[PDB]
């Protein structure tokens, strides 16, 4: 039971590590510039102690280990103190790899689009099927049933799950579902998650652009390590993915196809909108069933098919997996309406990178018709760039009427420049500004938004508690 201190602990990824660490029995403290919900509340309930600011005093007394988030850099007092005093430190992904993943059969999902859709669907299938899989993913499914076990499992976007059972062979457990992405390296360990994580089942969800080689290289770093007895699951007929494998692969492939190096798994559409389809696996005549769900779109069918195949790889029948997805209620923080104040609609969405922001805003425009649309975005900060041109963030917000981006004071990372440079170079990407205070963003909205408008808040986490702070402010405006 070590004492672990986490720098940046209120953010989704690092907070997830804190929660997993507590579940392991560790004592967990942390620092963040702000303490904000929903993660603060989850941390507090788990018995984590959070302190405000990045202060040397937070590392007194000395913890056994410091887990360092991506925003930390040299020149910061707490970091210079850490290095001078010789405290032990590690990155988030290395900590997770050593403390949780090493002992599990890890299922990692990579892709340019829809990674969290696929991981939420997969984690749902596993738990529906009675497999007590751990996970650290980008969101959670909505749980509409009165099943209090599924309610508790999906209370957080992290869950430890159980270890492979040493005595009872009837139990199928010891798994961990995770997203492979370009985030959460640290200043002293620039290895990506594609290098850190060692999945035995890997999904390559897709590989497309709304630097191909940079993305293929990163995917390759994960593919090239999978054991010979593992499985790679990906869509068929996708040259960008076939070329990824061609760099070096030692593991059997299952290829997936949605029909309306040939495929092993097929989803045949019954309803053109993707709300109903049959799933079949070529090597098992019984491995066929129907999905009849409240989701739609070809991307969601593709996501379902790779999730079903991955679950089949670890024992879930096609029948059970398809029953699970037929019961899938959707995903929290996917254009989720959280307020309607003075006729201003407020939505919450987990999009935090260009392809996700694009998809969310496409959906928002289809939904909201002619309403004036405000995008309020905290993109997920990162010291590294992967495949996406600098202009990608600004381009992704083209469909909004107004966009307010957030870059935090003291942890600036070049956002204002990438946006401002993009809007000069391509005026068609419209009206966008980068602000340095959540208070200024809220004031801007309260000041300029009017009855009929819609606001879409986008962040991988709590965005310094902007959600309730905005709803409160909007409800306090004195009408004329």
Author numbering: 0 to 209, 216 to 265, 285 to 504
How did the manuscript describe this experimental structure?
Recycling of the bacterial cell wall is believed to account for ∼30–60% of peptidoglycan synthesis in Gram-negative bacteria. The Mpl protein is used to link the breakdown component, the tripeptide L-Ala-γ-D-Glu-meso-A2pm (and also tetra- and pentapeptides), to UDP-MurNAc. Mpl is functionally similar to MurC, as both mechanisms involve ligation of an amino acid or peptide to UDP-MurNAc; in MurC, a single amino acid (L-Ala) is attached and in Mpl, a tri-, tetra- or pentapeptide. Mpl and MurC-F enzymes have three domains that are classified in Pfam families, PF01225 (Mur ligase catalytic domain), PF08245 (Mur ligase middle domain) and PF02875 (Mur ligase glutamate binding/C-terminal domain).
In this study, we have determined the crystal structure of a full-length apo-Mpl protein from the permafrost bacterium Psychrobacter arcticus 273-4, PaMpl (UniProt accession code Q4FVQ2_PSYA2, locus name Psyc_0032, 505 amino acids) at 1.65 Å resolution and have also biochemically characterized this enzyme. The crystal structure of PaMpl was determined by Multi-wavelength Anomalous Diffraction (MAD) phasing to a resolution of 1.65 Å. PaMpl is present as a monomer in the crystal asymmetric unit. The final model includes Gly0 (a remnant from cleavage of the expression and purification tag); residues 1–209, 216–265, and 285–504 of the protein (the full-length protein contains 505 residues); and 588 water molecules. PaMpl can be divided into 3 distinct domains: the N-terminal UDP-MurNAc-binding domain (ND, residues 1–102), the middle ATP-binding domain (MD, residues 103–357) and the C-terminal tripeptide-binding domain (CD, residues 358–505). The CD is a six-stranded, mainly parallel β-sheet (β16–β21) flanked on one side by α-helices H14-H16 and 310-helix H17, and on the other by H18–H19. These 3 domains are linked contiguously to form a triangular-shaped molecule with dimensions of ∼56×60×47 Å3. The largest conformational difference is in the disposition of the CD in Mpl, which is rotated 30° relative to ND and MD, when compared to its disposition in MurC (respectively). The corresponding residue in PaMpl is His210, but this region (residues 210–215) is disordered in our structure, probably due to the absence of metal ions. A loop (residues 404–414) from CD in PaMpl is folded into part of the ATP and UDP-MurNAc binding site. Structure analyses indicate that the orientation of the CD domain of PaMpl relative to the other domains is flexible and changes on substrate binding.
